[PDB]
């Protein structure tokens, strides 16, 4: 594909053009849940992963050209326990294989096997780390926040993000090829807060030609779980 | 128009999609510049506007609903004597038929007779402010900001914004309807540092029906030149 772009105002059970990965799954009022819930609510030690059917041509070497492309999608993190939650969400590209690591993968949101950026891994996401605690997570800055990952969890940049719970957010991810500069963009309607960030990064450096493209978010402790609910989402590349 | 899109990588002399206003027009080496510039050295107190020459519809009373928009644009702000420019540029959106006002207009980019915030100026915008001494610009915080203004020049809401002389800005400028929350967002892929900003804007309340969208910039005292050149552009709008 040369051009890809997709819009999912409501999900739907099973939803035919998702693949599933874990406990992922949309509920039966259209919303797609990362991890599991039950009763309304979430889980303990659930790890989940949702994507697009369709794998993304993000550059051709017959070309030369890398894709550009941009997503948004709005989001819910609720909490009973707001204090001190985990794990948190994040959109990745990806081999189109990919399955979720075998082992203790929650404090990683269900992306890797351990804090190592190993170059094989080929994993781009933005995350929306909801715990920072050194203890489990000695990697993270000392506040919930959004990162930008390159083959591994400790992220190569990031920005404080205020989390409100419950609270519906909308985020934007945005990659310009021309430039080697990947940005993340989150918003919060009801209180009118932003936060960003970008960093300088070479798909074509990280990724293989193609990709598939989509959603992961892991659970851990019963005292701090989070719902990792997604309700819209579009996505749009162009080679 | 439903729907309306357009994307401009490149500029063209006189471009007949374009309407100027002021001393606005675009370079031989396809420039939008909205401050005249002579020989490479932007000019002192400039006032320039260019706007996309189709109206855009903004709501419909027979139809109910609001359009929903996203901007990005490219530009450049290179000043010789850094340590203090004036006055800034801005995206904006006003009547179909709107002129540059008459008067001391530069401390308002062009914008503004005064201060006032006045509910028949009809105008949403989205300034990048480069002079906030109070000496001139009393309503302003103290630094550069990127601010949402709404009928005034004193901004309903700004950020702190780190101006690069000469540096190649990114900035997208989204609304989305439903939440009646207006975003802005600029990034300099060469230092990858971000800014954003939201507010609360209801285009119901404050513009008619049709509008003309584009950008505004002025120049101030002679000392304090800078250019206000913008390179791409692109607008979206769905009613
Ligand atoms: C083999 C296995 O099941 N591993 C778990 C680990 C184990 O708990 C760990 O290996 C024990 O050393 O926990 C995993 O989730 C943890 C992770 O979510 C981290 C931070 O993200 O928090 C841990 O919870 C803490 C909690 O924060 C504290 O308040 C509490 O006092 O202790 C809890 C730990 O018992 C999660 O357990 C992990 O990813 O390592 C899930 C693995 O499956
Ligand atoms: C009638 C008229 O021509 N008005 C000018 C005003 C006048 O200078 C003002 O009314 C005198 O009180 O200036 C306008 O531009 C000013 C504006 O750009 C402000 C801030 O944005 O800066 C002024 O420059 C200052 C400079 O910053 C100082 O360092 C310097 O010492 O003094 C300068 C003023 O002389 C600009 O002049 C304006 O918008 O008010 C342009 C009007 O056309
Ligand atoms: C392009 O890449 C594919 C796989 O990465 C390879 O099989 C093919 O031979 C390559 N062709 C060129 C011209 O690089
Ligand atoms: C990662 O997966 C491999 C499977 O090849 C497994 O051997 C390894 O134990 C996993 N990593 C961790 C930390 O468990
Ligand atoms: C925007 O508004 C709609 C309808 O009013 C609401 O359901 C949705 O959650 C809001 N989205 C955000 C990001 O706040
Ligand atoms: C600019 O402000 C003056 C008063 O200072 C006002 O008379 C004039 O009408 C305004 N300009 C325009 C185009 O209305
Ligand atoms: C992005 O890269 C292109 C090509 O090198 C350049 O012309 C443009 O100014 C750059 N944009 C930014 C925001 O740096
Ligand atoms: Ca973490
Ligand atoms: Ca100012
Ligand atoms: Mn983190
Ligand atoms: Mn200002």
Redesign the interface.
Same mark, same amino acid.
């Given at each position: 594909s040369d051009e890809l772009s997709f819009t999912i105002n409501n999900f739907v059970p099973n939803e035919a053009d998702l693949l599933f990965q874990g406990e992922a799954s949309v509920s039966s009022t259209g919303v797609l849940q990362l991890t599991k819930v039950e009763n309304g609510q979430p889980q303990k030690y659930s790890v989940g992963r949702a994507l697009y059917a369709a794998p993304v041509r993000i550059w051709g070497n017959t070309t030369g050209s890398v894709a550009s492309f941009s997503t948004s999608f709005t989001f819910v993190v609720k909490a009973p326990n707001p204090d001190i939650t985990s794990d948190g969400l994040a959109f990745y590209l990806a081999p189109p294989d990919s399955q979720i690591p075998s082992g203790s993968v929650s404090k990683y949101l269900g992306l890797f096997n351990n804090s190592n950026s190993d170059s094989s891994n080929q994993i781009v996401a933005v995350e929306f780390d909801t715990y920072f605690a050194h203890s489990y997570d000695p990697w993270d800055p000392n506040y919930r926040h959004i990162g930008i990952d390159v083959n591994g969890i400790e992220s190569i940049?990031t920005?404080q993000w205020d989390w409100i719970n419950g609270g519906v957010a909308?985020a #934007?991810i /945005?990659y310009?090829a021309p430039?080697? /500069?990947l940005?993340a *963009?989150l918003?919060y309607?009801s209180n009118? #807060? #932003?936060? *960003?960030?970008?960093? *300088?990064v070479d798909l074509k450096e990280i990724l293989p030609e193609w990709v598939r493209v989509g959603f992961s978010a892991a659970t851990g402790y019963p005292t701090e779980v989070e719902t990792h609910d997604v309700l819209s989402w579009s996505f749009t590349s162009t080679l």
């Open positions: 940049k920005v909308f #934007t /945005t310009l430039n080697k /500069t940005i *963009s918003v309607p009118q #807060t #932003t936060f *960003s960030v970008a960093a *300088s």
